[PDB]
Amino acid sequence: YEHSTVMPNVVGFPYKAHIERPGYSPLTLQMQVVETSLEPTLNLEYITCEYKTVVPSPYVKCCGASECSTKEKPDYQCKVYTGVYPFMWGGAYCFCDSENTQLSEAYVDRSDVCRHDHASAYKAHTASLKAKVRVMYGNVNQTVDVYVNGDHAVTIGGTQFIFGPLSSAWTPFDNKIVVYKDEVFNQDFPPYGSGQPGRFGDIQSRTVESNDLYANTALKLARPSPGMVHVPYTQTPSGFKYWLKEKGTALNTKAPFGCQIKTNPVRAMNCAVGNIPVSMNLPDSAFTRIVEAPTIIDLTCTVATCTHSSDFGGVLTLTYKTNKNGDCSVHSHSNVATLQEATAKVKTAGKVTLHFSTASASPSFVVSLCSARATCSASCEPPK
């Protein structure tokens, strides 16, 4: 049988399907979601941390020129200054006046603490939805994990279940995100190779261990005024350390729809968004049909006690007669009240106690038992 309902995406909401059939009633089906997990597929774009700026000993040569070479270090510079340390009192003990030269150079390395303290910038791509639904119909209190796409399928009690594509494509994560510690940020970080100086991503490395590193910190060599052999410069201080003030508006601060943003896998637990279309292929054996099912007669419904708007304040009992013992499927045909249970062990005695929830002073509602039905009423007030 091709049963198909559309339940709501909300944790701890007990759904009840009951779309009927010739032959016999639809074994009242209970199912509710235990947890959501909206997880986006990430591409680690790069790593950034603060930088350790590196400056070799300068190379001086009296009465003779130095020539700069290309080097493949990050943010690498070298300039050959001329006329730097005039005479021997000029600061290098050189003979010539102008004709002395200094090759000055520098480059940026990954901080000495980058493995401990750093961030990851991800491309967060189309997210897969994962549930942990507990299904209940007949004799199964079995629970299950399943992708809430239109594709994946699970057997439960020999019944196929497919929890369809979510009715909403919403996500709290943007096209680009950034993770630091246990927090995540929606952030348009600069791409690898184009990080700009003094702001986030000034240094970029594919991974942390990755040996390669793109740096742009406006590292600017300067001319050594006569005084001592040295190598001065004008860099821009890390944008990582700068960004640790612009880190703040984290997603886990704001929980739209009760989302819980958790760290190690980037995700959104128990987000209450949208409906879950469900579809299932029940075999005929899953039903307990009427020629085989027990006939009950003289079905009546008394209510012992009841509370206004509690979790399950109601306490009703059903008197009846049946030809033999079996397994019925109780269910209310009036939204004004709902039953804690959806099945009951019908004995020969003629007495089945049920518990139910409501939110009315004087409700009237049609309770069924197997194929039989009856009407129930009571007076109900709330506690302090």
Side-chain angles (χ1 to χ4, degrees), residues 237-357:
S238 184
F240 184 73
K241 201 190 168 186
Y242 173 79
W243 173 68
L244 302 187
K245 192 154 186 280
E246 271 196 59
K247 75 92 211 311
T249 302
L251 279 44
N252 33 37
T253 308
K254 212 285 170 183
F257 314 124
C259 285
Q260 284 183 287
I261 310 310
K262 289 293 290 151
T263 172
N264 201 317
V266 179
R267 64 203 203 271
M269 312 298 266
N270 303 0
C271 292
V273 191
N275 310 122
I276 301 157
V278 183
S279 285
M280 57 200 286
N281 170 225
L282 284 147
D284 299 25
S285 27
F287 298 78
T288 171
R289 299 227 224 71
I290 203 161
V291 179
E292 271 82 87
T295 320
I296 77 172
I297 145 180
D298 293 310
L299 180 56
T300 51
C301 174
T302 308
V303 178
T305 53
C306 166
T307 320
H308 196 298
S309 300
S310 304
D311 201 310
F312 291 113
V315 179
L316 71 80
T317 306
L318 307 184
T319 41
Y320 60 94
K321 290 183 188 67
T322 189
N323 49 305
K324 38 61 169 189
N325 298 355
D327 277 28
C328 278
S329 28
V330 302
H331 178 248
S332 178
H333 290 84
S334 200
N335 72 334
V336 68
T338 303
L339 287 41
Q340 188 177 141
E341 51 266 84
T343 43
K345 301 288 186 181
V346 165
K347 294 286 189 182
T348 57
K351 187 270 195 178
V352 168
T353 303
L354 303 176
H355 298 82
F356 61 100
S357 197

Side-chain angles (χ1 to χ4, degrees), residues 134-152:
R134 190 159 48 75
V135 184
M136 293 201 318
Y137 72 110
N139 293 6
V140 263
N141 198 24
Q142 195 180 29
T143 202
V144 53
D145 301 69
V146 39
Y147 294 96
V148 186
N149 56 358
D151 193 38
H152 181 97

Side-chain angles (χ1 to χ4, degrees), residues 67-291:
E67 205 173 67
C68 261
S69 71
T70 307
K71 293 194 180 281
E72 299 289 285
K73 288 286 190 194
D75 215 349
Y76 177 76
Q77 323 282 341
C78 79
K79 191 158 187 174
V80 175
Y81 293 105
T82 314
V84 293
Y85 306 131
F87 306 101
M88 73 166 73
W89 52 94
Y93 308 93
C94 291
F95 176 51
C96 288
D97 184 350
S98 59
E99 297 103 4
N100 316 296
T101 67
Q102 158 161 315
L103 187 164
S104 217
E105 79 188 334
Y107 57 87
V108 177
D109 195 351
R110 209 184 288 91
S111 157
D112 217 325
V113 295
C114 197
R115 68 191 165 283
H116 191 328
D117 200 27
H118 66 281
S120 300
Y122 295 103
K123 294 258 201 158
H125 239 101
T126 165
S128 190
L129 179 44
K130 172 272 201 177
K132 192 172 205 311
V133 187
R134 190 159 48 75
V135 184
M136 293 201 318
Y137 72 110
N139 293 6
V140 263
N141 198 24
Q142 195 180 29
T143 202
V144 53
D145 301 69
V146 39
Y147 294 96
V148 186
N149 56 358
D151 193 38
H152 181 97
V154 179
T155 312
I156 315 183
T159 299
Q160 305 298 350
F161 284 92
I162 300 186
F163 301 82
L166 197 71
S167 51
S168 187
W170 175 90
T171 165
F173 310 113
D174 287 79
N175 220 290
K176 276 179 177 157
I177 58 167
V178 168
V179 174
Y180 176 45
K181 290 284 177 182
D182 306 343
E183 311 182 48
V184 69
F185 307 99
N186 285 303
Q187 192 167 124
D188 185 17
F189 60 85
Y192 184 81
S194 46
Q196 288 292 301
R199 292 276 168 277
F200 182 91
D202 54 25
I203 70 176
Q204 309 182 293
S205 68
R206 292 309 202 173
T207 76
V208 184
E209 59 280 46
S210 171
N211 67 259
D212 294 279
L213 173 54
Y214 166 90
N216 181 214
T217 61
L219 180 77
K220 297 147 170 167
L221 257 27
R223 177 172 173 77
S225 36
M228 184 46 167
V229 178
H230 68 317
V231 35
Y233 57 88
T234 45
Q235 205 170 12
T236 316
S238 184
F240 184 73
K241 201 190 168 186
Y242 173 79
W243 173 68
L244 302 187
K245 192 154 186 280
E246 271 196 59
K247 75 92 211 311
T249 302
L251 279 44
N252 33 37
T253 308
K254 212 285 170 183
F257 314 124
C259 285
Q260 284 183 287
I261 310 310
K262 289 293 290 151
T263 172
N264 201 317
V266 179
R267 64 203 203 271
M269 312 298 266
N270 303 0
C271 292
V273 191
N275 310 122
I276 301 157
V278 183
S279 285
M280 57 200 286
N281 170 225
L282 284 147
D284 299 25
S285 27
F287 298 78
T288 171
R289 299 227 224 71
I290 203 161
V291 179

